[PDB]
C-alpha cells in the first residue's frame, strides 16, 4: 500500500545491472512517501510494477530514459512536498539520445499541489504541449514553473482515445462540486466519495485534521508503522547524545574523515549516517587533514545501533573485514544513501564481511557489489535482517 521513494537526481545508477531489480523491489504493489525517480531504463524494460501506484508525496522525475513509455496509468496526485531544483514537482528531461520516451500516459494525473512541470530536451516525446497544466495545479499553490520544450522528431496524454484529459478545476476547488477536503476529483457530493484526500484520509473519510488516531503521511492511521517514531503531538515522524552525518551538526559533511572521528568515541547509538569515502583515508593537501588510520577506526567498536545508513566505498587494505562493527546490531534505515540503500559495500576488497552482530535492517535495500575478494555474502541470513516486503540484497561483481 505505502512505499518510500528514492533520492538520486540525474546521477548514474550505483549498479546499472540491478537498477531495474532495485526499482521492482521498491514499487511492487500504491502511495509513494517520497520522490518517484525513474532514470536510465533500457528500451526493453518491463515496468508492470508501476501500474498500481496512486499518489507520490514528493516529485516525479523521469529522465535519461530509453523506454517506450512509462505506465503510471492510475497516478492520481503528486503532492510536491519536495521539488526538483526547488521549483518542479514533475521533471521529464533528456529521455533518449541527442528510442526515448514516447508519451506521458499519466492518464489520471489530476492535482499537483505544490510545484511545477519541467519538460526539456526530449528527442521524441509528443503531446507535451497539448495538455493543459493550469487545470491540474492546485489553486492554493499556483507556483506553476512550466518550462516545456516543443521540439520533437516524430488535449490528451497520448494518441489513444482512452487518453482523454478530464479538466477538473476549470470546469469549489474541485468538481466533476467536491467536498472541501477532496484533492483529486470526486464521484459525488459527500466527504467519503472523492479519490484523494486533500489533507487526511481517516479510513476513507477525508478530514482536515486527524481526530486527536495518529497522523502519518496523509492518512489518519491507528498506529505508526514499524520504523516510525510516535510523538506526544500524535505524529509518526522519523526524528523526534552522538550525532552522525547529516544531523544537527554535520548536515553538510559527506564522509567520516579524521576531523570528525574523535566525537564518535565511546558511543553506543549514532543518530545519523556513517559514510566512508575514498577521501577519508587520504587527506586532501588543501587542509591539514591527516589520513585516517586503521587503528583510529576502533572508536566504532562500541557502536550498537545506527539510525541512518552504513556506506563504505573505501577501506584500508590492511583490514580484511569489518570487525570494527562486530557490535553494531541494527541499522534503522531512517536515512538511506541515495534514498534507497541502508548498507552499501563497493570496491572494498574485503575477504569476509564480519558483521556478526547485525540482526536487522529497518528499511532500505542492500548493495554488496564490486568486492572482487569477498566471499560469505550468501551465507548471511539476509531474510532475517529485513523487516518489510520491499528490502532485498543486490550483489554483483563479487567473488565467484
Amino acid at each position: 500500500q505505502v512505499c518510500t521513494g528514492t533520492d538520486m537526481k540525474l546521477r548514474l545508477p550505483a549498479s546499472p545491472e540491478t537498477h531495474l531489480d532495485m526499482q521492482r523491489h521498491l514499487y511492487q504493489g500504491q502511495v509513494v512517501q517520497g520522490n518517484l525517480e525513474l532514470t536510465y531504463l533500457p528500451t526493453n524494460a518491463s515496468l508492470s510494477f508501476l501500474q498500481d501506484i496512486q499518489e507520490v508525496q514528493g516529485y516525479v522525475l523521469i529522465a535519461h530514459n530509453q523506454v517506450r513509455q512509462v505506465p503510471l496509468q492510475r497516478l492520481r496526485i503528486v503532492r510536491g512536498t519536495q521539488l526538483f531544483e526547488d521549483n518542479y514537482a514533475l521533471a521529464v528531461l533528456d529521455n533518449g539520445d541527442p528510442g526515448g520516451l514516447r508519451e506521458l500516459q499519466l492518464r489520471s494525473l489530476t492535482e499537483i499541489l505544490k510545484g511545477g512541470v519541467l519538460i526539456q530536451r526530449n528527442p521524441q516525446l509528443c503531446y507535451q504541449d497539448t495538455i493543459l497544466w493550469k487545470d491540474i495545479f492546485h489553486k492554493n499553490n499556483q507556483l506553476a514553473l512550466t518550462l516545456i520544450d516543443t521540439n520533437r522528431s516524430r488535449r490528451c496524454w497520448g494518441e489513444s482515445s482512452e487518453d482523454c484529459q478530464s479538466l477538473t478545476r476549470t470546469v469549489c476547488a474541485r468538481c466533476k462540486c467536491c467536498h472541501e477536503q477532496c484533492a483529486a476529483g470526486c464521484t459525488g457530493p459527500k466527504h467519503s466519495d472523492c479519490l484523494a484526500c486533500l489533507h487526511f484520509n481517516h479510513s476513507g473519510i477525508c478530514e482536515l485534521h486527524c481526530p486527536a488516531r495518529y497522523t502519518f503521511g496523509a492518512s489518519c492511521v491507528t498506529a505508526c508503522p514499524y520504523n516510525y517514531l510516535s510523538t506526544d503531538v500524535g505524529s509518526c515522524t522519523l526524528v523526534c547524545v552522538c550525532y552522525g552525518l547529516g544531523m544537527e551538526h554535520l548536515r553538510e559533511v559527506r564522509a567520516v574523515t579524521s576531523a570528525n572521528i574523535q566525537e564518535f568515541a565511546g558511543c553506543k547509538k549514532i543518530f545519523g549516517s556513517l559514510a566512508f569515502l575514498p577521501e577519508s583515508f587520504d587527506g586532501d593537501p588543501a587542509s591539514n587533514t591527516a589520513p585516517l588510520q586503521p587503528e583510529q577506526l576502533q572508536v566504532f567498536e562500541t557502536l550498537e545501533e545506527i539510525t541512518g545508513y552504513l556506506y563504505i566505498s573505501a577501506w584500508p587494505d590492511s583490514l580484511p573485514d569489518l570487525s570494527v562493527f562486530q557490535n553494531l546490531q541494527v541499522i534503522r534505515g531512517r536515512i538511506l544513501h541515495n534514498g534507497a540503500y541502508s548498507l552499501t559495500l563497493q570496491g572494498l576488497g574485503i575477504s569476509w564481511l564480519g558483521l556478526r552482530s547485525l540482526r536487522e535492517l529497518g528499511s532500505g535495500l542492500a548493495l554488496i557489489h564490486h568486492n572482487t575478494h569477498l566471499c560469505f555474502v550468501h551465507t548471511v541470513p539476509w531474510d532475517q535482517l529485513f523487516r518489510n516486503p520491499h528490502q532485498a540484497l543486490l550483489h554483483t561483481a563479487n567473488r565467484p
Partner: nanobody
Amino acid sequence: QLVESGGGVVQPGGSLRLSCVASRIPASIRTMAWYRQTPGNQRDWLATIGSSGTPAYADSVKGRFTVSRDNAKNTVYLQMNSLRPEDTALYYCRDVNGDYWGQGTLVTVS
C-alpha cells in the same frame, strides 16, 4: 576524470586493448570496472579489477577478455580477443571507489 584509448575499427576475429588513464594520481590505486553499452541497452558489466589485482569477469565475456593494470602509470587495460561483430558498442571504465565514469571509446568490429 578518466580517458580511454585503444578502440576503433577492427576485423572479426581480431584483438584490441583499451586503456583507462586516470587524470589525477590517487593515493590508493582504487578499483576500476569495465562496462559496455550497446545502443538502446543499459551499459552491461564486463569485468572488474581491484587494488590488489584480483579480477572478476562477467559470464558472457569470461575467457576471451583479459583485464589488468599498471600501477606505475595508473592505467587499467582490457585486452580483447577473438572479436566478433556482436561486440561493437561503447566501452567505458568507471572508478568504483568514487563512482567516477569514463567517456567511452567506441569499438567497431567489421
